[PDB]
């Protein structure tokens, strides 16, 4: 659909090298790594979530398009 | 050796000044004249059956003497003969409970006695506060009691209202200043300042007075086949 | 943030509850009435010889006088009349004590005993009632065959 | 059978003007109590 690429572009950690890209009938892969500093067993104190965002080609040979960069504090989970 | 009752007068303990004062003013009695407690105050002290009938040594206060009286009249007495003799002695036993006992009759007003259904939601709450709340601390002795009160006001508003709306009590913490938490309601449904209760709003009150996981009430709501329980339960901390 | 803190924002919303009434008249002060009528009426009537009504009731195909009024003037029920006209058709009942072990204290079915609130009543019964209330096609079992 | 009939009616409030204030407001309270005691019965009975 096209209402999904918007909620995506609605995002702040879903940034790319070029928003121009076409995001329909495309398949994306998210090889993300998370770092976190706690202050309790559940209540985080700092959260990093980075990692590339890759796309299927007609060959399905994934390729890099954009980057995730989520930063946060006092979280209770990972969005 | 050990010393149980020699200690309760100490300062480190939580008993109240006047309680220590009385338990001091009571003179003991030697073993020779020991077992007279089954009948009389032996030095300002008596034995009393439990809800299990088992005996208990206790100071000779007006309230526990009243306990003694009911124990040789009411619970000694069996199931069927219980309700009716209560129907009879009501006017007297509640006068007592309100004069010389720690869990009084709920349904009383400015000293004027009555029953539950003779009592308005407004009086209900103004007494719930009068007991479950402390003007000194301006706090609630507990919260199952404050919780009780809030769950009461909730269906109050369920009743007098017409269609759905938002509770004027969204968190029971609003009760921490009660006398306003009521007018906040009894100005929303002034009818209750006048109306008595529906009984459907009595059986509830009671099923709640019998709530496990909650602290029993510091009063008596009713007379029924369970008077003893409502009478002699959690009857220790008060001192 | 967790709904831990946002749960409180799931506000508590009270369903209403049926508080039937007796429809007693209203009593206005002596002013509104000693005025509406002539002041010459005072001391002018032997009341012993004046008659009055003091109570009344009724039974019909619209139950009592409290509810018929509704279908008489308003054309449709309140809930105060949708339960009363359900307590007297054997649709619902009461129960205090315990069921499921849990203490229910309120209205309930009478064929299932499955608890109910006086809100899910109208949507649940208002139909059959009106299919079984008022003028109708005669129902034999009220007339033994 | 031709035993026809015609009753009529008046509004009560055309009554209390026949009497004195103190007696009215005295009547008043003596009723309010009733409504309540009646409210009670109606419901204790309606349930059980
Ligand atoms: C206030 C109080 C509470 C007691 N609670 C218990 C109890 O919970 N379990 C128990 O086995 N004995 C209990 N006892 C009995 C004491 O262990 C002890 O036998 C008693 O205090 C001795 O009485 P004395 O001070 O006259 O020597 C209690 C006694 C008192 C005075």
UniProtKB/TrEMBL annotation, chain C:
<protein>
    <recommendedName>
        <fullName>Fatty acid synthase subunit alpha</fullName>
    </recommendedName>
</protein>
<comment type="similarity">
    <text>Belongs to the thiolase-like superfamily. Fungal fatty acid synthetase subunit alpha family.</text>
</comment>
